[PDB]
Amino acid sequence: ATKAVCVLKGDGPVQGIINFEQKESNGPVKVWGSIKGLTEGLHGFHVHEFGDNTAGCTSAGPHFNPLSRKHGGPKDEERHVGDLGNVTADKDGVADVSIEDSVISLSGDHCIIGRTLVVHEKADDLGKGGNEESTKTGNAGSRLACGVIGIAQ
Amino acid sequence: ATKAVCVLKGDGPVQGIINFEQKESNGPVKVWGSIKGLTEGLHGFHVHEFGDNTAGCTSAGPHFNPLSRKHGGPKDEERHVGDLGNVTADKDGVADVSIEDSVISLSGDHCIIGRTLVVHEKADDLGKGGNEESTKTGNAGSRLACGVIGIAQ
Ligand SMILES: O=C(Nc1ccccc1)c1ccccc1[SeH]
Ligand SMILES: O=C(Nc1ccccc1)c1ccccc1[SeH]
Ligand SMILES: [Zn+2]
Ligand SMILES: [Zn+2]
Ligand SMILES: [Zn+2]
Ligand SMILES: [Zn+2]
């Protein structure tokens, strides 16, 4: 098994801990944890290309897209590798994250270790927003919190 | 060329930005940047095994040591991959970092991306301190600041 972890930090405080576990290189990645300090509703959840947080979340670059595809939701064939959809925050502002994803990996050229996990202001429209931006970013607004994805024990 | 970057933060005044560049596969890695908020003198400079900053620097684990060697300095044969020696802070508390290292890498088994860069309270004795701890950690004291090493553009 390979394991990774990410601390999400940004103003609010929006703060979170996200764990990644992959039992074999050819297998899905289980993504679990918690994010607090969010507004109730959906928040875009992306792996951005660079693990560069030198100017905060703005330095992380575009959606991680090694295969040169368009933006989508995690269940879509047409998606970026970094398209993990939305997390859902309750009325206490807590998003309990539980995702399994077959496209991200913790090895090979879909590897997300060393890249930036980002939680967004607004919902990711999953490429179904009806404008040009929808199929590039999903219109999820500002980057509320982020962190670099690291190797875990 | 491959590039990586790391933002060093902690609980106190120490903060920094460190850049990594490796022009050729299996070539030396250039390390440069700046750290401020330090006491004047030598400060241990390590890649630790885990990119896990969930409890700050304390979760980063031992020295990155994929080859099962003892602790040393960067110019020693007997060293951990993560043994980058010391950085030097001036009387303004600023350390200008400029290192070339041929043991760390930005790809493969020696890869430091997704691991934690740590700057220490005290000098790393480079395995020459005269106690057992010297050849395990180098006696560099507390972890003042750290961050996860991320992929850069
Ligand atoms: O292993 C990685 N990439 C990779 C890319 C292409 C072929 C084989 C391997 C990787 C690189 C940097 C950080 C994290 C990982 Se997982
Ligand atoms: O690139 C990496 N490994 C790797 C391993 C075997 C073949 C090719 C590449 C890597 C994995 C995890 C974190 C960081 C790096 Se740089
Ligand atoms: Zn995003
Ligand atoms: Zn996308
Ligand atoms: Zn250390
Ligand atoms: Zn060491």
Side-chain angles (χ1 to χ4, degrees):
Chain A
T2 304
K3 293 175 180 196
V5 70
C6 186
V7 179
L8 296 174
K9 285 198 175 290
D11 295 356
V14 173
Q15 52 180 81
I17 301 287
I18 305 294
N19 301 277
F20 300 83
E21 185 175 337
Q22 190 181 29
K23 292 312 272 185
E24 57 283 319
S25 58
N26 283 340
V29 181
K30 186 174 186 283
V31 186
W32 66 271
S34 196
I35 308 170
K36 65 178 154 194
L38 294 164
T39 55
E40 193 256 39
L42 297 179
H43 294 273
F45 194 53
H46 302 148
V47 182
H48 282 253
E49 184 176 6
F50 311 121
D52 182 338
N53 292 342
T54 52
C57 305
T58 192
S59 299
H63 295 194
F64 179 48
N65 185 23
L67 296 171
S68 302
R69 304 296 178 75
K70 302 185 185 175
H71 183 74
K75 291 201 289 184
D76 302 334
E77 189 65 9
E78 193 66 28
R79 60 171 268 192
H80 302 143
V81 170
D83 292 345
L84 296 179
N86 291 293
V87 303
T88 303
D90 65 23
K91 279 292 205 200
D92 293 324
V94 180
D96 289 310
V97 182
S98 181
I99 287 159
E100 179 185 287
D101 194 77
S102 269
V103 176
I104 60 172
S105 189
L106 305 182
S107 72
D109 75 0
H110 301 172
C111 185
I112 64 170
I113 286 155
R115 303 193 187 275
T116 297
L117 187 68
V118 180
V119 62
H120 277 274
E121 185 197 359
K122 306 191 293 193
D124 187 332
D125 67 28
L126 314 181
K128 309 291 198 162
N131 67 6
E132 204 198 326
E133 191 175 332
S134 181
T135 61
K136 299 195 177 180
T137 71
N139 291 293
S142 73
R143 303 176 182 182
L144 294 184
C146 61
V148 184
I149 299 168
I151 294 165
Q153 186 177 317
Chain B
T2 307
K3 295 179 164 177
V5 69
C6 187
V7 179
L8 297 169
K9 292 175 181 182
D11 296 319
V14 183
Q15 60 180 77
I17 302 288
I18 301 291
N19 304 100
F20 304 83
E21 186 169 1
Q22 188 175 31
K23 296 184 287 184
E24 188 169 0
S25 175
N26 299 312
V29 182
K30 296 187 177 173
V31 185
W32 77 99
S34 195
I35 311 173
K36 64 181 168 175
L38 295 159
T39 55
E40 193 255 38
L42 301 178
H43 292 274
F45 196 53
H46 301 149
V47 182
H48 282 247
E49 186 181 1
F50 310 122
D52 182 336
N53 289 353
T54 56
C57 306
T58 192
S59 302
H63 294 197
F64 178 48
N65 185 28
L67 303 166
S68 303
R69 304 299 299 282
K70 298 180 180 290
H71 180 74
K75 300 303 154 187
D76 300 336
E77 192 280 329
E78 187 75 34
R79 57 170 275 190
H80 303 142
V81 166
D83 288 346
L84 295 179
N86 291 292
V87 300
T88 299
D90 67 21
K91 286 293 284 193
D92 302 329
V94 180
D96 290 317
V97 177
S98 185
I99 290 162
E100 186 173 295
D101 194 75
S102 61
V103 175
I104 62 177
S105 189
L106 301 181
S107 72
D109 191 39
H110 301 207
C111 188
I112 63 170
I113 295 166
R115 302 190 185 276
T116 298
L117 185 67
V118 180
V119 64
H120 278 275
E121 180 197 1
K122 306 194 283 194
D124 188 332
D125 65 29
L126 311 189
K128 309 290 176 68
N131 67 10
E132 188 183 352
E133 193 174 341
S134 181
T135 55
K136 290 195 54 184
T137 74
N139 295 294
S142 310
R143 302 179 185 180
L144 297 187
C146 61
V148 182
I149 298 169
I151 297 168
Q153 182 173 323

